[PDB]
Amino acid sequence: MEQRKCYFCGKMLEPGTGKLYVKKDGSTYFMCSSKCMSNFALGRLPRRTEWTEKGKIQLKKA
Amino acid sequence: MKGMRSNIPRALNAGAQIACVDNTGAKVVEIISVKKYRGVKNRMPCAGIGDMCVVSVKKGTPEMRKQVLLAVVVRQKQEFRRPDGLHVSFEDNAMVITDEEGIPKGTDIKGPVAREVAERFPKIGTTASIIV
Amino acid sequence: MGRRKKMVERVTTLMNDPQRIRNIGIVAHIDHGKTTLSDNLLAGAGMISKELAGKQLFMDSDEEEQARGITIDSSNVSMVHTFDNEDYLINLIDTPGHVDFGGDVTRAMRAVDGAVVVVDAVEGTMPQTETVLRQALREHVRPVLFVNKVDRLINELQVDSQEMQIRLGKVIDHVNKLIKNMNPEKFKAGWKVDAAAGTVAFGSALYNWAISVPMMKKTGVSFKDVYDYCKAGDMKSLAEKCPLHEAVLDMVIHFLPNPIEAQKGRVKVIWHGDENTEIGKAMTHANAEGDLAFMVTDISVDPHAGEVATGRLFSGSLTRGMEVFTSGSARKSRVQQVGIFMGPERLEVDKIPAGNIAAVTGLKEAIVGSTVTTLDGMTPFESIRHVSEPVVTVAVEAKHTKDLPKLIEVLRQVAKEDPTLQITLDEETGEHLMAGMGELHLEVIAHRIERDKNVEITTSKPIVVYRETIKKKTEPIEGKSPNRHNRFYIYAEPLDTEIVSAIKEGEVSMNLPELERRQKLIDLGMEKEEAKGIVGIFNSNIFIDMTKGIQYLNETMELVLDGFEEVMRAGPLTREPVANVKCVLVDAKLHEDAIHRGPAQIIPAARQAIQAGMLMAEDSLLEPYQKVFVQVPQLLMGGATKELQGRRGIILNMTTEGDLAIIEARVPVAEMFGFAGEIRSATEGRAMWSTEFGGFDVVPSSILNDIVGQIRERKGLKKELPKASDFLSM
Amino acid sequence: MVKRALLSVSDKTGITEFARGLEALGVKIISTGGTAKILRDAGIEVTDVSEVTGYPEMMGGRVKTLHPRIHGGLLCLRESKEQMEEAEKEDISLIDLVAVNLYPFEITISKEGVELEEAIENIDIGGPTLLRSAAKNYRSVTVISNPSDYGHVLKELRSSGIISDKTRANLAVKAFRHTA
RNA sequence: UGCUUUUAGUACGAGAGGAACCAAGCAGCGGCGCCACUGGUGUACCGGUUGUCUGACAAGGCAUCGCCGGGCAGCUACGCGCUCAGGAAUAAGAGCUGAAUGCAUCUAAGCUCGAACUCUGACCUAAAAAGAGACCUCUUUAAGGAUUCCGGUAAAAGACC
RNA sequence: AGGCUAAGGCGUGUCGGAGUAAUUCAGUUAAGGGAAUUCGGCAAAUUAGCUCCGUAACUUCGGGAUAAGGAGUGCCUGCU
């Protein structure tokens, strides 16, 4: 059972759910939900988005 | 043909102009028909990953252009599910020129191919640099 | 299941077995026995079918070292010694530490876990040794002592056992005494060796015999017994009883570190990027799953398999195929074949995890100074760069008239022979102006000529290659075509040093997408307008078309940029290449047709204009400097420092590492003449100096007119200053 | 039809449009030197001459190439064995459309005495060859030395489809005359 | 109803070429259902922001839900599950026995096989089947039903649960 | 112009309602494909203001022309 992490929110992909998104350059990103996929496609960054773990890490950097 | 492990929605229908992503000299090919596909009344021929289509080279070299060829779709934007429940989607649609047997006319494939096509036609997998 | 094939599998197991890796090396003074030890080590543990090695010098996998008897540069081989019923992969870092090497030394040392100091049993610790040892230690590379050539003492100089060990003891002493003066903190962390601690062996590479205190006991063979065999022609017995590989590999594994451990302190010392960064933790504590770390240190261009870059897998697993980057030159190349190094050859294997030098083909972004990465903009162990061009030229002549042909071909080979010069091979006068990178480099090459080819020739007074430079922002100068049907109002002004640097860096190019380039420039400094209106970059010159709405300029362009590049190649003053000059076109009166816009009319106007502008903007010269590094004794600093100061020695550091006053300064290339001599002369022969292109600098205005006049004369020009007046003719 | 375009026009007038027009109908643009840039900047995709005639190019601005059995392709009859042969070989292209004008020669007396050197060193050599070659093709390949008739050509192509004998003829005659 | 694997590079054939029974998976179309997953919608809801009004802030109105971004439930497909048969009796046809017609004959009686057909069989509907049904339980001023009340697995009204 | 508001004029011309089913008039949105629909791109969608750059064939020299094709644009602080 592959254990997968959401690229945007950093949450573990629950088995039997979630998406894998592949760009032209072979880059692969796990998405836990349509919300994370939409925010990734909008160009928003997780480190700037507060509800994600990367945004939380960026804020707690201070 | 050999069955694939994944469930593939036939996402590309006849008339779609897909970028050709090998070094054969074809830049854009328009789907004409789908091999081994029998339709129904009013339904356009449909193709998903792993399907072989008859295509016409719309852009590219003068030798490729206007030719009726066989191509295999290797990338599709429509999401398809693997057996273990994970959904896979590519950033674009992409095809590669092949023969009836499935051998690619090109020698290298720029971009990732789907594991489904990589297994259904093993030579596409070897020609491709990475299989996703 | 051939013995070799079983070893091959073992090889792979060990590859994914970082705890059982030993990336060791060999560090010694010239003619101490490096190559000897190396090859006879390979054969000693019999990794390959014996015969294979020897005759075909394996460790010497290149072509230069293959005729010397002592190691010269890098590459690597492999050993797998069985210790207390256990094998261990022993990578054998070839040693590019020969005094005739600068950065290369560092590079390899930053890939060597530890080394083996090999001290001639007679000649003892030597200058070379000192240098290498201290360097390596500085870059945290624990060594062990293998006093080779004992055979000489034992037989040749008919010394007695007791004396034998007295001399070797004195060596041991010297060894540590230096270690002490090198790094007391590491001498406190007990890296210092002693044969009683198994970190020192005794033997003769040329005879493949070698002992060490532990093994000694284990087998019963004592120094006196050794002496007996040697005196009684029993070196064969010696070898067999106590192998050379035996003792060496014992030091190499039992007391020398493995990737993991080595990597820790190594990263801490060499690397400077915050260790909390992923890449950091990865290469510190053994992790190849993280950002690719593969500092190419060698480019084994396999004639029948392409460019095979050999770098240590500090971080980055090598699963077949990987699109990646590198340090500095972080572009977009891939990674195809990744062979490991079995024997001295390339055994193709798949995934290589940690601490395992691998050779990778299909790597455009892969050379010395480039640490192939999969994380763009990778932090630096020691900052590096990539630019280096001839700045000191000499007019190689052919005194002996019965040598010209030979000379011609010899320098026709010199090109690839040493890719740092750019000879202007000519027939008009016969004077081959060889452009070297450094006065010393020049001297060296020139000497090599009448030595390895022996052309009875010499070289005349070295001269510095300057650049022409403008001073201020100029006032629109009209450049008129002969027929007057075209007018090119243009001005110039100094090129922003930031932009200069980045252009020389290469990133900013004219083959760059508008957006991409523009951005870079924009932040670097180039005012948005100009950044958007650039149309060409030449070395350190740009022609910013800042005009708008001028008919036929779109096409016209070419001819003007032609004139531009011409003038830039040789400025109106000292006829030297222009540098740090940015032009701004302000108006372009043009005739409607192309009849009166043919190149013969356009080119002149542009040229005329640009030159006139340059001259009106107080044309100066750029003198290159040459960053000096003087590895000298502590004590020695009085005359040294005063010397550089008298030679405009901008000291940027002095590293007074205990007994060593390693002064690091910057002195103008032109003024580096003689320094070579005086430095050592004064410092009683104790001054290991080294330099490197310190960047062009706005020549001190002090005697600008003087320097100018000199150039004028040498290159046979006119004595009337090339007054802008004339250039901007009627 | 006409699917290749080697346009190294010394005079860079009209090439922008012409090139776009071509690109639209297809016609791979294989120009080099000056033209190349101007087009690959205006937008018109252009391939460099580098990958046609066996060996690349040199001193852009006039020289460029001058390859025998590549000029012999375009030359005349690119579809008649013997002749056509020089438009295929080893990646060698069967270019069917050429337009390369010659900037007129001039002497430009310099302030410091006639610039004879430069003058002589700016007599286009490459141009005249390519030109006279294409020109030679009263049949197949079409040459357009003169820049002031890109319209006519484009027009015919756009509408009709293939160029017309009448035109090819005039074009050639004119091109030869220009080299004259 | 096709493709692929197997049978099998086998039978057949001098070669070239090249099958069939059985078995497996997949696919196209059709049918039925479902919403864990994925996609759409989601004028519940949350946020950003333009113009303006309520004096400012806050909180609100309006501009297609003002527009833009996201989206739970629900519905939905572009998603998902299930969707062989076997037997009987036959058509063409192939045979058995068998005289007329000593023999022979699939035929004149008689008999055995034999199709995606028909019937049966695994599905839906069906006491308004006028032969208008069977059985059991409860109770005969009761059993029980409806109405009112709170609802939804149902629902145009009714009905249903 | 359009939007939001004064003053002034009005709520003036059938209600209620439980998902208010199907269907229909008029709208919003819609994965992947993108005219394969159809007699025909009908209908719908795209673009869109202003500033700057740039603008072809052809031409009756007036034009074509907003041709085409690119870039910018909000708020705040201080200014010329």
UniProtKB/Swiss-Prot annotation, chain A:
Subunit structure: Part of the 50S ribosomal subunit. Forms a cluster with proteins L3 and L14.
Record keyword Protein biosynthesis present: no
Alphabetical GO biological process terms: translation
Highest rank taxon of the organism: Archaea
Residues noted as binding Zn(2+) in the record, renumbered to the chain: C6, C9, C32, C36
Keywords: Metal-binding, Ribonucleoprotein, Ribosomal protein, RNA-binding, rRNA-binding, Zinc, Zinc-finger
Lineage: Archaea, Methanobacteriati, Methanobacteriota, Stenosarchaea group, Methanomicrobia
Cofactor note: Binds 1 zinc ion per subunit.
Renumbered zinc finger spans (C4-type): 6-36
PROSITE patterns on file: RIBOSOMAL_L24E (PS01073)
Family of the protein in this entry: Belongs to the eukaryotic ribosomal protein eL24 family.
Function summary: Binds to the 23S rRNA.
Database matches in InterPro entries: L24e/L24_sf (IPR038630), Ribosomal_eL24-rel_arc (IPR055345), Ribosomal_eL24-rel_N (IPR000988), Ribosomal_eL24_CS (IPR023442), TRASH_dom (IPR011017)
Record-given protein name: Large ribosomal subunit protein eL24
A cellular-component GO term for this protein: ribosome
Cofactors demanded by this protein: Zn(2+)
One Gene Ontology molecular-function label: structural constituent of ribosome
UniProt signal peptide: none
Name of the gene: rpl24e
UniProtKB/Swiss-Prot annotation, chain B:
Gene Ontology cellular component list: cytosolic large ribosomal subunit
GO molecular function: large ribosomal subunit rRNA binding; structural constituent of ribosome
Source organism, top-level taxon: Archaea
Gene3D superfamilies linked to this entry: Ribosomal protein L14
Pfam families reported in the protein's UniProt record: Ribosomal_L14
InterPro entries tied to this protein: Ribosomal_uL14, Ribosomal_uL14_arc, Ribosomal_uL14_CS, Ribosomal_uL14_sf
The keyword Endoplasmic reticulum is assigned to this record: no
Keywords annotated in UniProt: Ribonucleoprotein, Ribosomal protein, RNA-binding, rRNA-binding
GO biological process: translation
Protein family membership: Belongs to the universal ribosomal protein uL14 family.
Entries under HAMAP family matching the protein: Ribosomal_uL14
Functional note: Binds to 23S rRNA. Forms part of two intersubunit bridges in the 70S ribosome.
Subunit and partners: Part of the 50S ribosomal subunit. Forms a cluster with proteins L3 and L24e, part of which may contact the 16S rRNA in 2 intersubunit bridges.
Protein name: Large ribosomal subunit protein uL14
Curated annotation (Swiss-Prot), chain C:
SUPFAM superfamilies xrefs: EF-G C-terminal domain-like, P-loop containing nucleoside triphosphate hydrolases, Ribosomal protein S5 domain 2-like, Translation proteins
Main localization (coarse): cytoplasm
Diphthamide carried by residues: H596
Residues the record lists as binding GTP: 28-35, 94-98, 148-151
Cellular localization per UniProt: Cytoplasm
CDD domains recorded: aeEF2_snRNP_like_IV, EF2_II, EF2_snRNP_III, Elongation_Factor_C
Cellular-component GO terms for this entry: cytosol; ribonucleoprotein complex
Keywords: Cytoplasm, Elongation factor, GTP-binding, Nucleotide-binding, Protein biosynthesis
Domain tr-type G stretches: 19-228
PROSITE patterns the record matches: G_TR_1 (PS00301), G_TR_2 (PS51722)
Record-linked Pfam families: EFG_C, EFG_III, EFG_IV, GTP_EFTU, GTP_EFTU_D2
Coiled coil: none
Keyword Nucleotide-binding: yes
GO molecular function, one term: GTP binding
Entry keyword Cytoplasm: yes
BP-aspect Gene Ontology terms: translational elongation
Similarity comment: family membership: Belongs to the TRAFAC class translation factor GTPase superfamily. Classic translation factor GTPase family. EF-G/EF-2 subfamily.
Protein name (Swiss-Prot/TrEMBL): Elongation factor 2
